[PDB]
Design a protein around this ligand. Structure first.
Ligand SMILES: *[C@H](CC(=O)OC)[C@@H](C[C@@H]1CCNC1=O)NC(=O)[C@H](CC(C)C)NC(=O)OCc1ccccc1
Ligand SMILES: *[C@H](CC(=O)OC)[C@@H](C[C@@H]1CCNC1=O)NC(=O)[C@H](CC(C)C)NC(=O)OCc1ccccc1
Lengths: 306, 306
């Protein structure tokens, strides 16, 4: 038993991380097939990033201005193109370690694993959730751009994130693998505001179902409620509105534990109106919202990957 | 910036995970060079595990009674030996993916990364700390034995843990890679008690230094204290006694933030005597003790691995 936040095995992604250098700027790149993906601001200096005209900046750059290093071996760049906020460097060698991969654009509330890299070398892996305001709360130092977020079905790597920015608030913003930013963010060193960060309600309920599975029981109360009544209290505490869909994905955990979703919603209702009273749930003194209803089943059914 | 609990890249360990079957029992094995390491209770049935005589049980087993599977390829076992609570299966093929590796026995309070596996296939990775009572709080379902814990310097994998048991309390116990259990535990399905779980004081102080680095400041107070005075209050809250050694490892974070260790100890002293008042530090409403003083520097200096 036991419940922890768990990142996917990063072995398949490690084989695709390369170092990309342009001028004096160095970041990480994603080498899939014969294409290297990296943030387009690799063509930017520190002064360029204040107000960059990426088109005018990319005009001055050629193929030989891009040094792609895979450990100690170099990839000869034979073409480059700017797709939105990402750069696609065509190399003359296909990556022999390319797994079966996809490019997906996740939805708010869904989670993924981040392989933090510097100089194209992995440093650590952790689980991140795309907040409803399309930010993430990760760990990114200088040189961490180009690092990717991903999910794995069994042998298929679903790339979904690439890191670009840290906002003035300390949270992080990025794009998908097509260069499109998550949220209303642009890759420019200027003050940028995300919306009000709300709580992924279906995720806290799934995390409460996991605690119920793992022996944490004190929170289980005796009330029930309705979908609109709970949403009136959920909107009071900046929680996402629970839809009939969210009830359907939680069905698996509800049908196994025998607690109706509206019953769990009532136990969550009192948990917001009365606090934790100095108690903990699964070793945390607050409500966790970074566990999707599929992340708990993944940890209770024991799925694997090859 | 930002601070998260981070697991090492598990790519090098994934290449050493194989499936080990004996009779009807299947668990994970560690394939390094031409030796496969796995818990010795692979020779046990469900009824054997109540009171096993491992010697008498291993007498009945031969080399061909051990099926070692690496994906779809089998490893021919040509020898077996019981070292403490671990089984060493000699195969006729050296693992071509063996990294530079060591076998170490960690100290209480130190952390490591756990690659959770089932049927020799990785499932997830998370960071664990060896509690002062020589247990860990992980996530282990049925079939998770043989999974290992490890640390990486740069290209050297330091294996330190192998999973065996879940206690009646829900926490987990295991051995090093030499078969010696951490703590007073034996691999037998019987009621077994760990001691009183105490808090790794040097780890909470290092985690407070990280919050100080990442903008979390409200806890910083104005008192100071002495080593004995703080230990009198630390022992009151079941905290490990802080030694002059612990002050020396915290020197790096103390000399960078400019807060003396005894000053941080006073801010921690009031944090125990006054609680958090419904506030959070680094997104947690309690004091984290699973971050060693080297784990914060690892996340603030940005070390990498190859
Ligand atoms: C990407 C550049 C890189 O890593 O390698 C060239 C980022 C820096 C990362 C983002 C998270 N922390 C970092 O150090 N460089 C940037 O200039 C971007 C903005 C756009 C050009 C994408 N991020 C940014 O300006 O972040 C502000 C910041 C806050 C705290 C610390 C460093 C930067
Ligand atoms: C190892 C066996 C295995 O995984 O594959 C053969 C363990 C089961 C693991 C330990 C953590 N959770 C599991 O399911 N089998 C055991 O019998 C051991 C005891 C010794 C023989 C090592 N663990 C044990 O008895 O755990 C009790 C338990 C609690 C909760 C759920 C399952 C088992």
């Amino acid at each position: 038993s036991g419940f922890r936040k768990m990142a996917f095995p990063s072995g398949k992604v490690e084989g695709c991380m390369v170092q990309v250098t342009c001028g004096t700027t160095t970041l990480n790149g994603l080498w899939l097939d014969d294409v290297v993906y990296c943030p387009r601001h690799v063509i930017c200096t520190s002064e360029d990033m204040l107000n960059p005209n990426y088109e005018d900046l990319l005009i001055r750059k050629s193929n030989h201005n891009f040094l792609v290093q895979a450990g100690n071996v170099q990839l000869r760049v034979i073409g480059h193109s700017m797709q939105n906020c990402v750069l696609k460097l065509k190399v003359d060698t296909a990556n022999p370690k390319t797994p079966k991969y996809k490019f997906v654009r996740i939805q708010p509330g869904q989670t993924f694993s981040v392989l933090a890299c510097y100089n194209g070398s992995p440093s650590g892996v952790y689980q991140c959730a795309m907040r409803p305001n399309f930010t993430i709360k990760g760990s990114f130092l200088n040189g961490s751009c180009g690092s990717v977020g991903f999910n794995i079905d069994y042998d298929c790597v679903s790339f979904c994130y690439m890191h670009h920015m840290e906002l003035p608030t300390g949270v992080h913003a990025g794009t998908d693998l097509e260069g499109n930013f998550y949220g209303p963010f642009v890759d420019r060193q200027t003050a940028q505001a995300a919306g009000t960060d709300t709580t992924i309600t279906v995720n806290v309920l799934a995390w409460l179902y996991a605690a119920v599975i793992n022996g944490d029981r004190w929170f289980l109360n005796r009330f029930t409620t309705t979908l609109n009544d709970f949403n009136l209290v959920a909107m009071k505490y900046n929680y996402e509105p629970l839809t009939q869909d969210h009830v359907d994905i939680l069905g698996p955990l509800s049908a196994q534990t025998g607690i109706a979703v509206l019953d769990m919603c009532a136990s969550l209702k009192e948990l917001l109106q009365n606090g934790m009273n100095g108690r903990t749930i699964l070793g945390s003194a607050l409500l966790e919202d970074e566990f999707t209803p599929f992340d708990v089943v993944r940890q209770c059914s024991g799925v694997t990957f090859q």
